[PDB]
Amino acid sequence: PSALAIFTCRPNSHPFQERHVYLDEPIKIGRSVARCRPAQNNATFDCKVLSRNHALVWFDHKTGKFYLQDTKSSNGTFINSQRLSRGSEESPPCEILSGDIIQFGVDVTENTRKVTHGCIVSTIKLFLPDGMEARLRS
C-alpha cells in the first residue's frame, strides 16, 4: 500500500504527461534539471516558469490529510487559483483535497521578446494507502 496523487494536465497548462506519484514520503515539485528529470512517478516538469525547488507535496499518514507547500518559488503555487505565498517566500502547509486544481508558476510573456511561456496547471486526484479516494473538494 502507498498513498497516491495523480496529476492530469488541464487545457490551459504547459503540456505534461499524466503522473502517478506515490507519497510514501514527501515529493519535490520543481523544474527539470540535470539528474532530476520528468518521470511518471514524479512531479518534476520541463517548464521554464518553475523553480528548481518549487513546492513539496505529501501525505500525513497519521491524520489521512494531504498537503502542498510552496518552498520559496519565484513565480507562485496555487490551490484553486489561490496563491500560497509571495514570490520567493515559503508558505505554510496547505491541505489539498481530491479534485483540486493545482498550479505551479504563471504564464509569462517575456519583456524582451514576443514569446509566452506556459505554467503547469493540473487536476490532482488523491488516494489513501488502502486505495480509497481521499476527502473530496466541495
Q: After what residues is the chain interrupted, C–N > 2.5 A?
A: none
3-state secondary structure 31-99: ECECCECCCCCCEEECCCCCCCCCEEEEEECCCCEEEEEEECCCCCEEECCEECCCCCCECCCEEECEC
Angle 37-39-42 from CA coordinates, rounded to 5°: 95
- How many domains does one find in the chain? 1
119: domain range? 5-138
Q: Which residue carries 498550479 as its cell?
A: 103
**Cα angle for residues 79, 103, 112 (degrees, 5° grid):** 135
- In angstroms, what is the resolution? 1.1
